[PDB]
Symmetry: C2
Subunit: 44 residues, 2 copies
């Protein structure tokens, strides 16, 4: 992927690690499902 979008993804992950709120929306269900497919659990 292009380096700017990677930087945006780093910023997104940094946000989620401090406040995973956005992940609990319907918009982000696909992302939760992907994490779950890898054996993870999105925390509260």
């Amino acid at each position: 992927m292009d380096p700017r979008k990677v930087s945006e993804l780093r910023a997104f992950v940094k946000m989620c690690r401090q406040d995973p709120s956005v992940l609990h929306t319907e918009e982000m269900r696909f992302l939760r499902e992907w994490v779950e497919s890898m054996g993870g659990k999105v925390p509260p």
Copy 2:
């Protein structure tokens, strides 16, 4: 989000599903670490 960036993230997840090796690089270590923090593991 920017709906366009949600779209890009969906496309990125699709790409990673199709070819998990995209996540194996040092550039993507931050993403592996995030997944591991949630108890998952990126596929081989």
